[PDB]
Amino acid sequence: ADKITTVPVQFAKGAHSAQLKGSFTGYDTIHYTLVAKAGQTMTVKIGGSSNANFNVFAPGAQPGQAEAIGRNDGDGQWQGALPASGKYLIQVYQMRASARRGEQVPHSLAVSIQ
Ligand SMILES: [Cl-]
């Protein structure tokens, strides 16, 4: 019975970044979505619970259906030039061990596009 919550991210007028605060428990996950253009550089940084991880998916790609174009490194961050235009998906999740313990995962996701 796993839940996915989708959170559309829209930058304020004239802004190229935002920070979101969220939380999820166990195997629940959050999909943060963001429309961007091919060739722009996206930077993603996750903070808060050490259990928090993310995968970046290009438009149309769903967890389980295609490979992510990126994920958090050991410092909780990722940066890359975007191959495609459209709505990107940042999947925030925790790994099986702590999911299975039912840990709650408060986190902050900072995303910017330039
Ligand atoms: Cl922790």
From TrEMBL:
The PTM N6,N6-dimethyllysine maps to K3, K13, K21, K37, K45, K87
What keywords would UniProt list here? Answer: Signal
- Protein origin, superkingdom: Bacteria
Peptidase C-terminal archaeal/bacterial domain residues? 29-94
Query: Would you tell me the protein name for this molecule?
Result: Peptidase C-terminal archaeal/bacterial domain-containing protein
In terms of the parent sequence, the fragment covers: 22 to 134 of 134
